[PDB]
């Protein structure tokens, strides 16, 4: 019930760009718990502290054979994305104009 999962995630679809603002990433979990959390947080080039507002209530997951949707908010220019306890670092970049 309270778990940020210790697992490895991956995007299985190209992040859409709904101009409404949101960049909808969508990932699948390779790990063990059952209904846990996404260390979903964004940031700059180091864990340069935060530059990014997540717009997902409290996104989670239930089993291994399904995908986990996400929709976040990115003010623009140069910036980064992340997912994961470090084992299996999700260092994704994102540009915007």
């Amino acid at each position, epitope marked *: 019930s309270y778990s940020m999962c210790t697992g*490895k995630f*991956k*995007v*299985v*679809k*190209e992040i859409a760009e709904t101009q409404h603002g949101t960049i909808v990433i969508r990932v*699948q979990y*390779e790990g063990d718990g059952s209904p846990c959390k996404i260390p979903f947080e964004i940031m700059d080039l180091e864990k340069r502290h935060v530059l990014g507002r997540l717009i997902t209530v409290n996104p989670i997951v239930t089993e291994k*054979d*399904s*995908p986990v949707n996400i929709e976040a908010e990115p003010p623009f220019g140069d910036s980064y994305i992340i997912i994961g306890v470090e084992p*299996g*670092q999700l*260092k*994704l*970049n*994102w540009f915007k104009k």
Partner: antibody, heavy 113, light 112 residues
């Protein structure tokens, strides 16, 4: 668990059609991408294309077009495909996959007289 | 158009040695920081099981025998503890550019 399952086998007169079928068992096809690879006697692999169930869009390897045309649907079943004005070389196996970032789980056609 | 080039069109390694395969791409294949590289393993009349993505991977729990390596589009993989299931043509892939292809691959052979 999750089982992408292609249809047994089939054969056809040269210059005809076929319609393979990749029946996914545990995930809603919509969820991701689905592929179609090709493989013959010794030849390694050649990518025939991918399809995104949700928005029907789909891109292929250029010279494979005129031939096949991938298509699964927004509804209740599996991801299909079919080649045309078939030759002899195309006489060979086909596979389907699903995961963007590494085909994790995947799924023989002959041209004769 | 795009390209990759699995050099060793074939090779054979002793039973206890270090095997190593190094793919290579035309002029580019980089996307979102990590490369969406992909590595596989296929055996006659059987289903090509997958084993790698982005050069930092695990999938379908392969007791770590086979791991990744490399990053601008110049690459190179490895399978140190070589064994029996080990005979197959590992194929080099790429999910960055849209005419997603695989490569020439390579045949493994052991030393009895």
């Amino acid at each position: 668990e999750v089982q992408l399952q292609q249809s047994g086998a089939e054969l056809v007169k040269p210059g005809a059609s076929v319609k393979l079928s990749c029946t996914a068992s545990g995930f809603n096809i919509k969820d991701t991408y689905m592929h179609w690879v090709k493989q013959r006697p010794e030849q390694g692999l050649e990518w025939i294309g991918r399809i995104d169930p949700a928005n029907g869009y789909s891109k292929y390897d250029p010279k494979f077009q005129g031939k096949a045309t991938i298509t699964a649907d927004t509804s209740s079943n599996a991801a299909y495909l079919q080649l045309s004005s078939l030759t002899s070389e195309d006489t060979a196996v086909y596979f389907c996959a699903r995961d963007y970032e590494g085909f994790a789980y995947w799924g023989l056609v002959t041209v004769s007289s | 158009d795009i390209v990759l080039t699995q050099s060793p069109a074939s090779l054979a390694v002793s039973l206890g040695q270090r095997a190593t395969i190094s793919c290579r791409a035309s002029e580019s294949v980089v996307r979102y920081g990590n490369s969406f590289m992909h590595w596989y393993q296929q055996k006659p009349g059987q289903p090509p099981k997958l084993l790698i993505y982005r050069a930092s991977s695990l999938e379908s729990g392969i007791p770590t025998r086979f791991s990744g390596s490399g990053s601008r589009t110049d690459f190179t993989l490895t399978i140190n503890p070589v064994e029996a299931d080990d005979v197959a043509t590992y194929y080099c892939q790429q999910t960055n550019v849209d005419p997603w292809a695989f490569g020439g691959g390579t045949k493994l052979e052991i030393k009895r």
